[PDB]
Amino acid sequence: PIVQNLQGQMVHQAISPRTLNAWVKVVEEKAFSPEVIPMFSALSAGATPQDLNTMLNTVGGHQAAMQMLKETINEEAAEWDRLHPVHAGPIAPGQMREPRGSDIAGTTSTLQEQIGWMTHNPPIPVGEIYKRWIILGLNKIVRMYSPTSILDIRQGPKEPFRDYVDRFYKTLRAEQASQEVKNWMTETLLVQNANPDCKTILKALGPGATLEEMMTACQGV
Amino acid sequence: PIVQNLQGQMVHQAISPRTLNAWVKVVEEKAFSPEVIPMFSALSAGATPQDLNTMLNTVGGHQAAMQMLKETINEEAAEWDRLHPVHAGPIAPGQMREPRGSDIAGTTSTLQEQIGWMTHNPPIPVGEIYKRWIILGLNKIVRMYSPTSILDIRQGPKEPFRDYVDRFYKTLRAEQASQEVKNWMTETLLVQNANPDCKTILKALGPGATLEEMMTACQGV
Amino acid sequence: PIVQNLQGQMVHQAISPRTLNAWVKVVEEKAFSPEVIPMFSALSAGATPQDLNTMLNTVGGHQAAMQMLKETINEEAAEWDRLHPVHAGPIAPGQMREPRGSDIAGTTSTLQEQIGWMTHNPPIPVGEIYKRWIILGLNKIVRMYSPTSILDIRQGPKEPFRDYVDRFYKTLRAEQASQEVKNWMTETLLVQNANPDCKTILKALGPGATLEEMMTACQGV
Amino acid sequence: PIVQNLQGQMVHQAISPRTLNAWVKVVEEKAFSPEVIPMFSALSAGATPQDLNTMLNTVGGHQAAMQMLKETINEEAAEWDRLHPVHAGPIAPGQMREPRGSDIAGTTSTLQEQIGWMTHNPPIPVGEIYKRWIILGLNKIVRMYSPTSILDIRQGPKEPFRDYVDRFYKTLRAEQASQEVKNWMTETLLVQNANPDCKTILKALGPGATLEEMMTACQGV
Amino acid sequence: PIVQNLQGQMVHQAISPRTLNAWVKVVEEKAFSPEVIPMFSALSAGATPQDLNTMLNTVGGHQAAMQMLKETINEEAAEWDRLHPVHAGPIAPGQMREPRGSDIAGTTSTLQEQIGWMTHNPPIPVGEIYKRWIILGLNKIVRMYSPTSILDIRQGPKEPFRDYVDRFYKTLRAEQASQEVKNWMTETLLVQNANPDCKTILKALGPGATLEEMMTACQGV
Amino acid sequence: PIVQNLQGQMVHQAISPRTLNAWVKVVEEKAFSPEVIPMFSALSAGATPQDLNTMLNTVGGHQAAMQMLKETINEEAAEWDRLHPVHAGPIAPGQMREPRGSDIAGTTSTLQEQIGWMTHNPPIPVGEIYKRWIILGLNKIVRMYSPTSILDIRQGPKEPFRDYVDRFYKTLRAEQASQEVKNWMTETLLVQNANPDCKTILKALGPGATLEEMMTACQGV
């Protein structure tokens, strides 16, 4: 990675053994549960493309998912090239060549070139660009690998309201719909698919009640 | 996070793998027991909003609680906006834009903007503001998820006084009443809800006896 | 905490995850055995009041003991205020306000104020003052939670002398009597409460024999 | 290893105990699965030849594989010598001798000479040269130790398409054919060796469908 | 401890949690086996008296041994005072007071005074003086707690010579006789107390054979 | 140890708890398997003689081997003295005394003297000299403690060729013959002591076939 050291300057160092192991274990334990994605982001903080590739390549198994991720990365890289066409010419002293998509994904660039772009003035944050592309691919996999739909989450007749809400928001997190759609699902389905007793009590609260108030309302039900 | 390095200057670095893992395990093991909140605060020391979001987003399950936390954060952010209305105008050289609530919660600000505010002169401690909002939400969850009321904690006839006091103060810690109310509960209920034998001995001590003296008094009872 | 960094200057940093976890496990495993207190001191080296509060607040359970500790801290803080009455007036540029007891215990002071006092010229070692108060409270708890009295430690007829000495000095360590009283207990009781055979052999050594000599003397008995 | 320290300068330090142990455990657990190679690369970041030899020599067992690796290293070293014949003459002040293959592999060079080459202007990246040779040998071993051929991976009649794809791309990763050949295997065999029902559905998608689309298509089959 | 930092200057820091835990576990696992003493020395490298006291005070149980250690420390401290009598007078600016034995053992000196002595010009290595005294006491305990005498180590009739030598040198290590006495034990007893067959073969080697030669000689016996 | 810090200067620090523990566990688990020696070297990187003695002295048990190691160290030290006779005279300002063998082995030198030699201009690498002597002794022990001879490694009639090669090269690694002798063993015995079927197939390859080719040849046999 690259980190702001104890002077304010930015410097390169290798990924720590513990970071590597943490990432490998996360994938082994949690597979593609939604919380894996922010764990990926945290563990890859300040990463170069080489560092990000290291993390992805250290995964054994799940090679359908890793292949899907590769294809998503290829799509993003091709899009980058279209928007940012590389201009032919000899690179001047004290200047970096313009990165292609494959340079951003770390397949046709060296570590020094990556370091060159990331610490340039102005910086070309190639690590953060690639990480954006990776996270897009991870989101696609999390959706793909989710078993349930939000339309199927229904409160059981003896089910504590808190457990139903836990299942509701777990499933919602895996859905790849925008925030406005997620707001509608919260506004519409949560109360609609609650059990008869709770549902009546929540209808009586009326529009605009908080989740806290809803959970306190259906607590002894 | 951001920490005072070995010169006196403040510098950014990523959240350590061990910090991340410590937080995830704390939540897995202890759920929303009161001691989780100071553990959160300790692990999030010097955190940026991005770091704080990382910690919250790495939790799998408990999504009813995490949704309640989000709503509490939205309420605080809306309150901040009301008190601190952003003034329209082009931002001058060597100046930061005024943060909205969503900038403080790390959803509409970048890491560099967050770093910009936190290390400014004078500093806008956006990490500590957001952490205050998070802890408010955590306190609400701890209350919500507490099984027992302080009014129900009664000493059993053969129960050692020390075990009753342990149960009393555990339950008291989860209550979300102010210090003056907590003082009244200590002054009123502890002796009132003790068992007949101990209760008589503690009445005989009179007003203003210490807990130590009370525990020594009822020791062989 | 605060530590003398690699230049000689003192700088603030957060409590390490491992420190926090070490402290939590110590309390879980050993409860209030005497060795917990030096472990507390070691783990809290260079701590600010905020750091010390973090350590105490991260304990779940044992809330009778933690309440007793709070009360002891209140007593010490009230004593400090009596000895050090705060003088009213506007604080000058390049000067710190005088700390009250509650500032020392970290309840009415900020982290920056704490850092202000601890690194001042001359320093007001607020961390070490508070730690002294905490350790007083811990000593009271260790005494309270000790099962046995030193007067009851008697060597069994077939008990190896070394095992009796182990029990003797374990129990002695939990007693809250001064060194001169502890010297008298060693001088008087150890030989007095030994078993008939050993006791005769130790009487024959006479006054002023070392523990080593006593243990070698009763070895094959 | 050697790493860009907190000034921008490069400095030597020993391999960490955790790095060593991580490498030993990786080999113990995963043997020569493909993901071992990027784990090797990550753990050996900034390594000197002495460091790389340490990692290889710490492996107990697998000595057929380690012997094959030695022979591959000898072949590469002999090739280097042919391309880079060492010119006889006394080495001038402020100059390094030209490295032979055995100097690159760390068998006839000292640590200081290795450090001399790696930090020279221009640098002779002897660590990265040797690592390239090692990885060539590791790739040969991974191929050798792979049980299955990509031509034998066929979807079972009741096998979920996702599990077949996992097996397909696991086996493909162990094959030592170029990217163009791997593209042909993906284009040709994946659909060809799918089960009758899925195979018909994938033929209907037509040329140029993505893996994601293929996996969504055969999901309920 | 105190360590030569990255400039050449010496600086104070607290004992690491891992150091503390390592020491506590060593004592729990190995009790007072001879190898505990060099482990103590290693873990206490650059320690102040306060640090050394921390390590000793964190031991729970073994309080007979810890009391013996205290008494040995008192004897050494009294000897120091006799050799180094403190001269009465007001301490000058830029000068340290002369340490008594109790200052060296860390019971009547502060951390800053300890740091004062250890970093003085010329240094008064109070940490290393105290550690010498501690190790003397540990050696006494290891002897005390050794079950066997070197005179009783005799090779069994079917016992491999290598196992007998292991037992011989284990027991020898616990003996508190000087090197010249230990040389005589090696020269005299090892061959003398070997079994009839081996003993004859070793007599035939004659005076001045190495241990290696002796072990190769009796290998198939 | 001593390491090139973040300025280029060399500085002393104590052996890390994890290094110590890693070494102790290595010896406990793997005894004197050949891979222990490079693990020793790695863990002792930049070590002073005091550090190297710490590592050897922390081993409990195996005292026959540790005694053999001591004797080998005495032989090397006596050889050093013969080659480097110490010249009598008062040591000048800004000069180090000439080290004897016992100074190199860390038994008659102080830590500061060791540091004096290792950081001198030109340096006297006393740590690396002693480590060479230790490794000589370790090699002798590994040979001594090897059960099998390379002449006895014969392929079983149903034994996969890869497993035979693993056993062959494991045993070869423990032999203390030079590289030219090891080359002859590879050239002569491997094919000679293979099973009838494989042996015929390997004879047909002819002189100069690689191990890889040999292993591919006998794969389905």
Ligand SMILES: [Cl-]
């Ligand atoms: Cl996996």
Ligand SMILES: [Cl-]
């Ligand atoms: Cl990689």
Ligand SMILES: [Cl-]
């Ligand atoms: Cl790969």
Ligand SMILES: [Cl-]
């Ligand atoms: Cl660009």
Ligand SMILES: [Cl-]
């Ligand atoms: Cl959880």
Ligand SMILES: [Cl-]
């Ligand atoms: Cl996040």
Ligand SMILES: [Cl-]
């Ligand atoms: Cl998220």
Ligand SMILES: [Cl-]
């Ligand atoms: Cl503001």
Ligand SMILES: [Cl-]
């Ligand atoms: Cl607890």
Ligand SMILES: [Cl-]
């Ligand atoms: Cl707190």
Ligand SMILES: [Cl-]
């Ligand atoms: Cl709290």
Ligand SMILES: [Cl-]
């Ligand atoms: Cl004051």
Ligand SMILES: [Cl-]
């Ligand atoms: Cl292995």
Ligand SMILES: [Cl-]
């Ligand atoms: Cl090696």
Ligand SMILES: [Cl-]
């Ligand atoms: Cl080796």
Ligand SMILES: [Cl-]
């Ligand atoms: Cl070259």
